[PDB]
Symmetry: C5
Subunit: 147 residues, 5 copies
């Protein structure tokens, strides 16, 4: 059970259908664990996630970062994903808070659809990341001060 | 977004494309009720983060604009690495959205097509400004207000 | 140096993605620990490798050494690279922030076969879980000798 | 313009002496043209040694120019040396709030490095370019910072 | 390299042990440069792998003017090579800037064993990166000594 944990979810909006599916999977895991109302924030792109995740981390036991980065024609994909990786890792360690990475980094749109948790998808990384965030928050709760 | 304080730092390497990105940035700003954002010019993309850091002390959002085109050497990779590392750090250090409108392309054609010129497919300068403003407004709603 | 280490406080954080291989790594870690006079190290489980650094950071506050264990296998997307980047960045930062050895027993493989071959199963060529724990304990003992003791 | 008041430091590595001296020559010439006859010039052995010296120079200078030549060899060592320089200089710049200009050449061949050093027959001078970059940014930050 | 005194500089050497023969050769080259510069007894610490270097380098940096990092990373079958070298790069660069101390990189990052042998300073090797890194550390420590507060 994870009813006591304060969960935040930050989801980017670039590729709306896939982003909403990831968020759907996140909210479903949250509600299944006894959390009907997690803090849900929307940002435009994946680069905007870390700075919002940092704000959310000040008031929550866990933050789920959700987004979809699909490779285009330029090397820009690599550096967007690099920024997200660097940002979320820093935010997690700065705040000592699990920042779960449900940010899809795919070569094609099909690969992103297949990992969003749609009807015919093979997996749901939005669901997976929320499990990851909540379990780590509960683990840290057991590791931290409680008399 | 009339209340948000916006700064724009744009490098100058590849002037035509950099001015187009800045044009797209200014137009989004003005459309959102911001006629005069703080606009600073730097020479290259490596010079952006340290100026972005200065601008972040006095602004709710900073838009980083620039054009990095791959040449003959691996130098492209390390310039883009420095920008990525710098802007990400600045954003988290200052708790300020630092939007990345810095183009990282293989060819000049790809950069032109993403600058927002008459025949361009997209305007990344415009997109970055929307990104910066929306995140600044989001953080304003998330932060202290009684 | 795997010979002595009874006084060292050891933590082991192991992710769970690819359970069989993760348990094998943890098995190798626990066996090295027990052989060095440490029957009860702090063992924490996390879901994925991304979750390791923040737990490793917590464990580093009250342990002389932390062993990070996990299995990252390349899939269809570039996601593999960025997961491994986050772990690398995270563990390196945690080690230097806390001045504590954070041993990397996180497998970073192209295929499942390569991960199985490095977990320390019956037929495996090596055990990276065992290797990382030797690495963590030896470094903790080294730092103990380098640090203040009158 | 008028960069006479800015305090400039130049740190140049020594690995590939001819090319490193050419980069330094271009740096010194831009400096002198901007009204700075005597910038602080420090030499280091390799490019890895630059950031820690750049950090020291940054405490007492408005701008630091990092100069060096990294040419790819037989091993992946090239990538990690350039990674360290990139990481180091970017950190130093933001730690000190000081422009640390990157005039460190990262080339596949020696010809490419020669062509970017500002020798008689070179296509460009990255040592000159980096000094312009450092000075302009230092002047920009001076205008952005406190002055009543 | 024996040309200046370097007698006053406090030198630490941290060398990993993975690939013992090559690591000992790098250390040999390091100690010989040190002794030639008037330093018979530098602080020498051994670690198991290259990932263990930065945290020990950090400790050594607290009471030495220069630290030489020595090690051998040879590419295997997996991408693990890249991430080990990334960690060392990140770690040593951070430690150097945190402590304001030259942390010389004599950590070999090679595709084959032959390439590592050729850069260790063995009888038939083309170069000695252990020797080169110690020269690099000592020269930078002397340079920083001249740049810092004195008198
Ligand atoms: C591959 C790059 C691309 O075409 N689109 C990416 C993308 O794939 N996914 C995304 O969320 N945001 C993007 N770009 C927006 C970016 O995250 C920022 O919002 C922007 O750089 C301004 O900061
Ligand atoms: C591919 C590299 C190149 O030829 N030019 C790049 C480039 O593509 N784009 C850019 O904005 N600045 C550059 N170089 C200038 C650089 O950002 C710095 O100003 C320079 O390193 C000095 O600090
Ligand atoms: C190639 C990526 C993949 O398909 N699975 C990896 C994997 O191979 N190993 C792993 O431990 N965790 C994974 N993913 C989960 C990840 O570590 C985090 O739990 C997730 O990003 C939520 O924070
Ligand atoms: C990797 C390519 C190479 O063979 N040599 C490079 C190089 O190309 N350029 C350089 O300045 N220094 C090097 N190596 C020395 C390095 O910068 C440090 O001085 C050394 O690692 C000690 O820390
Ligand atoms: C990646 C190639 C490999 O198979 N082994 C390398 C290697 O080549 N060299 C090395 O010194 N240490 C290794 N591995 C050990 C590593 O440095 C750490 O000790 C380990 O990850 C525990 O922290
Ligand atoms: K928190
Ligand atoms: K407890
Ligand atoms: K601000
Ligand atoms: K609020
Ligand atoms: K500790
Ligand atoms: K002692
Ligand atoms: K300064
Ligand atoms: K002013
Ligand atoms: K020191
Ligand atoms: K002095």
């Amino acid at each position: 059970d994870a009813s006591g944990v304060r969960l935040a979810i930050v989801a980017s909006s670039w590729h709306g259908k896939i982003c909403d599916a990831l968020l759907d999977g996140a909210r479903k895991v949250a509600a299944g664990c006894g959390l009907d109302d997690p803090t849900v924030v929307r940002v435009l792109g994946a680069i905007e996630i870390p700075v919002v995740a940092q704000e959310l981390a000040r008031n929550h036991d866990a933050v789920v970062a959700l987004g979809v980065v699909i490779r285009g024609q330029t090397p820009h994909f690599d550096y967007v994903c690099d920024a997200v990786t660097q940002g979320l890792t820093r935010v997690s360690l700065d705040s000592s808070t699990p920042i779960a990475n449900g940010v899809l980094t795919t070569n094609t749109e099909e690969q992103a659809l297949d990992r969003a948790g749609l009807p015919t998808s093979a997996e749901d990384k939005g669901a997976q990341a929320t499990v990851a965030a909540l379990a780590t928050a509960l683990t840290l709760r057991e590791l931290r001060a409680h008399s």
